[PDB]
């Protein structure tokens, strides 16, 4: 139940449950595949 | 007028609740948001990207060098580098994983472990990396090394080589600042042949070495870090 | 009989060709992109010059000796003097940009070495007085010459210790921005592909640089024997979708 | 969820653990491409690290103090303590701020608890109830001068009265002019040659006002405010690397000079353990 | 439920009531299976034995104190109860140790009521209102020097802030490394010639710090600090013999020497009532 | 603001009370539990074991 | 009686919230509304209406 | 809601900036009558321009 | 929820949401519009 | 009704109403049955 009417007044926000660690770890252009050689 | 009680607790704040408050900008517009790539959702994410270990740590002054584990040609046998695996002291300690793992108190999980070759391309090696799961010390030769979770790597065409310290454990948590009972083990490395570089060159060659947390990990119990501190307030 | 190792990339009109690739990497997995609708707040139409500045500008070459720190360049500074894409830019109020960044260093099969190329999004420097003394404008507009880490101190200027970034971060931790190695065993080139990040839709191209591209030796140069003791290091850089909004009288910037 | 799966012996042609780190990526490499393992399961879901949570507790952010005596012959109220202000930020105390520059750009709510608490350093004969008075002072509103200025009358800026003692709170919208707050800046305000750099220029977002409403007692009461500062409804982009040495100032990264090592040295060799 | 059925006359070859103990059973015999009974009924389900009910409670776990007085001078304010801390157990008062010593293993969630009261020795004009900080220093944390340090700016460590006078009160998720807390432990933390033995080297759970956040007043003022525990959701596994010797150390089953005999001896023979 | 009336006992701390409080610890993960052999319920399920009585208690 | 826990922030006075409170004067009636021109809802209403800028402040 | 729509050049018989200030009105012109413009949203309100909000701490 | 009888002890009203410049920016009785002469 | 997230702020947990001696009292590999002779 929000008491208050702005946003900025309500609780913490909840988990993103995103988590995509791929723009990070794999930003590579040409995808790569794990057990394939790594340059051909 | 409806009856309530107060309990134990009233009017204290904790810094960790969560809970509701006015707005003290009644009304007001935050500006739009536009697209920025890169957003970061758990801490988890990042600790996957390797950053390199100053392993290297003999040095007087910190120096890119330290980053840097010399190899010697022909040697037979020896051992190139050795290190325990509390991950959040020691040389692990300044590297982002190392980092993070010190914003929480419990660890758990499997780390990855990679050494990147940069000698010339006429040379080759063969090196064994061994983890020594705890309850032994670490090795003194490499047969003794040879004995637990290793990886012949054999220096070629591929560049790096992933070494992954599985987690060995009874205990599902280990702290991160260094204790006795929920230690890790050891990592050392050793020459398997040995390196031979071509003609016309010579000296040290060295590995360059990464760390990054394998998917399975799990951070748990957030604390303060020992690595920050101050002794007055700064000002502009 | 394609190889992650053999490349050709045709901006504008001009082409790059690599026999000795190593992949490349697009920042935070986003390729750059013009400026939508949804995004916009100045009302301005845009320009966009397109295969005008959508070239590759090859800088002045640098020169890897055995004791070389790095050096580090600024965009879109760097670019403040390449043809018709350095007039856009003090020409219009407003511009925004990608790139496309190429370096390059061949040696042979005898010599070793590493570098680091790393593209940071806001790179705040340091001033090497500490406290809060500032870094004046000019050194940290250094153009088409860079900053070379191994020049020393000036008064004004930045702090140029590698082991820390020119930041107060360590060395090592470079790693968590978008970057490639250059080693001379597997690799030749490094290319990184820059979408556009800032925190506004558009900004000025002079008194803000978004990205510093940096290129540090990690494993020192080592030649063969008898082999001059240094190599080349060229940087080529395209901007990519460019656009420029709020064109008037043509900025005077300091120095 | 799996955290290992069962894997056995292994005589391949294809090798997961043979890649090239040039290329900046992370392979994601796991236990089971290199030992025989068996099936786990995770029990875990990384819950506690997700960014709401990490930078979502209270922090401190702001130690300041004012006093209430007796204003008769001050010259300048401000100077005196009679009331004072803090050209409000983030980046003052450190504990916080290491944790926020993790990222280059962070947009959030913020829930604000300001406590207040008295102090009576030399005699009195008791411990007077004051009540304290906080004003948002915007870029071009006007600043208090006198601890009883108009100023104060605030009918237009929000301000809270509380008990010395007491606690106030409330929350604040995202009110960053972009649409995220800069951690860093690598710019200018203008091209100027002599402008300062940083973000300090970026981030003008006003000073906070305390003063005590009540007249003065015959004896002189110490009142220290301490701001405390809890994001919520974060969202944060650009990760970078953390910070090393110990900071020096607010809104720029500089670092003292002749610091120490960073990294600990080793006692023994590359070789020990 | 019957608390007892009826029974009458038996002359059986059926023979309840002769058992062999050696087998370790305690046979289920009953009133009737050697009396005449009537019916009765139970008139009663055994809620308040329970193990959620018997740990349930709260219990005083700690009693520390600090004082508010000039720090001026002070070379060790840890030393001076400046601020002070509790290297966290809930074996250090025995009341509620013999009550979880019953088990061997015990997992549970804790509700931490914390009282604080205030004492003024000596000659004082007034009582002041202090508002007391209590911070938890995980293992690997900064620990508190001094009563104001960077430390107690508390950014990722959740902290309480309370008055004198007052109680605080919240509640902890079972921390625990394993599956549950060891009562027990019969090994070491590693095979060490010389490594302490007991519980001392599992049970690593840090200490929480309290501190006055009020600046000192004229006279000196003793705060004494009382934590309470009371165990919710409990789950125990593995009775054991209950408690005889008195205790001497946390965390070690040592017994004091020249101890009484536990046992009451008759006052008369074996023979007496 | 809905009005209250607070009653007798208010701010009192009674050691057997039950009610909820904030966790200091938001959003932390246990330990999973493993199976253990012996688990107590009910203190009633450990005094029906028989154990030996010091009857001779004349030492 | 209902339990309760007062949070940081009772008893404030925040000159921007906006709650309830009892009327003092309970049953009035207020004059009735008529009809004026001119209503204002919103000050972005009227900063369109033009107005002369003293461009030439050099007295 | 358009903060701005798209307009590119004119050549008319028909000047929206020309105008007779006499008459008392204050003739709505936007930028698009004047100058090439692109769509942009207003992401915005006016809500705190309320003359309830205005007046009501 | 109103905890009071009375209709002034509720909170503040809401946004008018009317918004409507014409009576103020264009009071004039023979109608402008705009591209059109101004005066005829 | 719990008025927080996570679970170890909820009250007291209410009565296993579990109850089996039998693990501590009859721990016996082969059954024995009360009347039956104890050792046959
Ligand atoms: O939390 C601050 C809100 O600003 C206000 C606005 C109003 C008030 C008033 C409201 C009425 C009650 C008194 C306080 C106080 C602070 C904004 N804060 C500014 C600093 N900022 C950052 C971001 C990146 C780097 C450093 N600081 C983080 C965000
Ligand atoms: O209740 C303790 C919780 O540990 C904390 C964690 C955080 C805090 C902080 C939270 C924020 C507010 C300040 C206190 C305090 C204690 C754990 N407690 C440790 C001791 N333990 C046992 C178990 C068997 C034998 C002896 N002790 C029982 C369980």
Redesign the interface.
């Known amino acids: 139940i929000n008491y208050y009417k702005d946003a900025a007044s309500t609780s913490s926000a909840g988990q993103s449950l995103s988590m995509d660690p791929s723009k990070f770890t794999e930003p590579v252009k040409d995808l790569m595949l794990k057990g394939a050689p790594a340059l051909n | 007028?409806?009856?309530?009680?107060?309990?134990?607790?009233?009017?204290?704040?904790?810094?960790?609740?969560?809970?509701?408050?006015?707005?003290?900008?009644?009304?007001?517009?935050?500006?739009?948001?536009?697209?920025?790539?890169?957003?970061?959702?758990?801490?988890?994410?990042?600790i996957?990207?390797?950053?390199?270990?100053?392993?290297?740590?003999?040095?007087?002054?910190?120096?890119?060098n330290?980053?840097?584990?010399?190899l010697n040609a022909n040697r037979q046998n020896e051992?190139?580098?050795?290190?325990?695996l509390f991950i959040?002291?020691?040389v692990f300690?300044?590297?982002?994983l190392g980092?993070?793992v010190?914003?929480?108190?419990?660890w758990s999980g499997?780390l990855?472990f990679?050494l990147?070759?940069?000698?010339?391309?006429?040379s080759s090696a063969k090196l064994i990396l061994a983890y020594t799961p705890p309850?032994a010390?670490?090795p003194q030769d490499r047969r003794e090394a040879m004995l637990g979770?290793h990886?012949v790597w054999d220096i070629?065409?591929?560049?790096?080589?992933?070494?992954?310290i599985?987690?060995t454990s009874g205990?599902?948590?280990?702290?991160?600042?260094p204790?006795?009972?929920?230690?890790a083990g050891?990592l050392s490395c050793w020459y398997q042949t040995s390196l031979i570089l071509?003609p016309?060159?010579?000296?040290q060659?060295?590995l360059?070495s990464?760390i990054?947390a394998?998917?399975?990990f799990?951070?748990?119990?957030?604390?303060?870090?020992?690595?920050?501190?101050?002794?007055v307030?700064?000002?502009? | 009989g394609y190889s992650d190792r053999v490349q050709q990339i045709t901006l504008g009109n001009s082409t790059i060709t690599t026999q000795e690739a190593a992949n490349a990497v697009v920042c935070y997995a986003e390729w750059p992109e013009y400026l939508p609708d949804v995004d916009a707040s100045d009302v301005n139409k845009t320009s966009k010059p397109d295969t005008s500045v959508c070239r590759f500008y090859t800088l002045d070459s640098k020169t890897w000796t055995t004791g070389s720190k790095g050096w580090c360049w600024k965009l879109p500074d760097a670019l403040k003097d390449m043809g018709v894409f350095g007039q856009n830019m003090f020409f219009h109020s407003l511009g925004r940009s990608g790139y496309t960044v190429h370096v390059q260093c061949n040696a042979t099969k005898f010599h070793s070495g590493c570098l680091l190329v790393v593209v940071i999004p806001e790179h705040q420097l340091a001033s090497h007085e500490g406290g809060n003394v500032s870094v004046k404008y000019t050194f940290t507009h250094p153009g088409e010459r860079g900053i070379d880490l191994s020049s020393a101190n000036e008064v004004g200027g930045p702090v140029k210790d590698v082991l820390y970034n020119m930041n107060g971060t360590l060395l090592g931790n470079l790693l968590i921005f978008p970057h490639q190695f250059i080693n001379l065993r597997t690799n030749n080139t490094a290319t990184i592909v820059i979408p556009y990040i800032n925190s506004v839709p558009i900004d000025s191209m002079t008194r803000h640089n978004n990205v510093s591209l940096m290129v540090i030796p990690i494993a020192p140069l080592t030649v063969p024997t008898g082999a001059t003791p240094s190599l080349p290091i060229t940087v080529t850089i395209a901007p990519m979708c460019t656009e420029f909004s709020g064109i008037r009288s043509k900025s005077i910037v300091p120095q | 969820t799996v955290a290992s799966i069962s894997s056995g012996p292994k005589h391949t042609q294809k090798v997961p653990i043979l890649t090239a780190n040039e290329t900046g990526a992370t392979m994601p490499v796991l236990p089971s491409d290199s030992i025989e393992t068996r099936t786990t399961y995770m029990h875990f879901n990384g819950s506690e690290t997700d960014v709401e949570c990490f930078l979502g507790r209270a922090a401190c952010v702001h130690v300041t103090e004012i006093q209430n005596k007796d204003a008769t012959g001050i010259d300048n109220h401000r100077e005196a303590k009679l009331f004072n202000d803090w050209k409000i930020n983030l980046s003052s105390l450190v504990q916080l701020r290491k944790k926020l520059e993790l990222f280059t750009y962070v947009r959030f709510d913020s829930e604000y608890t300001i406590l207040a608490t008295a102090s009576q350093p030399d005699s009195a004969n008791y411990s007077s109830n004051l009540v304290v008075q906080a004003m948002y002072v915007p870029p071009g509103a006007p600043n208090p001068k006198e601890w009883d200025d108009y100023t104060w009358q605030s009918a237009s800026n929000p301000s809270v009265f509380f008990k010395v003692g007491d606690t106030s709170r409330f929350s604040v919208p995202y009110v960053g002019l972009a649409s995220a707050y800069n951690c860093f800046y690598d710019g200018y305000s203008h091209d100027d040659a002599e402008t300062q750099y940083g973000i300090t220029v970026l981030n003008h977002m006003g000073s906070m006002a305390f003063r005590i409403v009540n007249e003065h007692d015959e004896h002189k009461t110490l009142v220290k405010i301490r701001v405390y500062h809890r994001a919520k409804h974060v969202e944060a982009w650009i990760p970078r690397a953390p910070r090393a040495l110990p900071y020096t100032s607010i809104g720029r990264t500089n670092y003292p000079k002749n610091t120490e090592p960073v990294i600990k040295k080793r006692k023994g060799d590359i070789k020990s353990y």
Chains 1, 9, 10 share one sequence.
């Open positions: 007028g409806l009856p309530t009680t107060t309990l134990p607790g009233s009017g204290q704040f904790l810094t960790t609740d969560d809970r509701q408050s006015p707005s003290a900008l009644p009304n007001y517009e935050p500006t739009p948001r536009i697209h920025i790539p890169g957003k970061v959702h758990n801490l988890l994410e990042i996957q990207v390797d950053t390199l270990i100053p392993m290297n740590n003999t040095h007087t002054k910190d120096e890119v330290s980053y840097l584990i010399p051992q190139v580098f050795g290190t325990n959040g002291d020691g300690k300044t590297t982002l980092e993070i010190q914003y929480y108190t419990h499997s990855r990679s990147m070759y940069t000698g010339p391309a006429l309850g010390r670490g979770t990886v070629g065409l591929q560049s790096t080589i992933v070494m992954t599985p987690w205990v599902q948590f280990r702290y991160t600042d204790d006795t009972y929920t230690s050891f071509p016309e060159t010579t000296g060659v060295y360059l990464f990054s394998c998917p399975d799990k951070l748990r119990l957030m604390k303060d870090t020992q690595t920050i501190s101050q002794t307030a700064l000002t502009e």
